[PDB]
Amino acid sequence: SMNPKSLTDPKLLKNIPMWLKSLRLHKYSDALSGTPWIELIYLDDETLEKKGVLALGARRKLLKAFGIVIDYKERDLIDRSAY
Numbered sequence: 001s002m003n004p005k006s007l008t009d010p011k012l013l014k015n016i017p018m019w020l021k022s023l024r025l026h027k028y029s030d031a032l033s034g035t036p037w038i039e040l041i042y043l044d045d046e047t048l049e050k051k052g053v054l055a056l057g058a059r060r061k062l063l064k065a066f067g068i069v070i071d072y073k074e075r076d077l078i079d080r081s082a083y
């Protein structure tokens with residue numbers, strides 16, 4: 001889950017359904033699996049709700065995970081193999 005090493009694992013970033021499963025959020029794979037991680041992590045609360053993530057808790061958990069990935073990305077600390 002909120003192990004930064006798991007969240008930023010290139011294997012998981014390149015497999016969003018499994019990335020979501022690691023957080024127990026795979027039920028939203030239907031709406032999110034098409035979105036590459038580089039785009040996915042910047043989605044906001046409003047967009048997540050509009051895409052079917054209706055539960056406040058779920059949006060908060062996604063946005064927390066996203067934030068961790070963004071931090072590594074913006075420091076150029078995500079392995080280039082993920083891109």
Ligand SMILES: [Ca+2]
Pocket residue numbers: 052053054055058
């Ligand atoms: Ca929901």
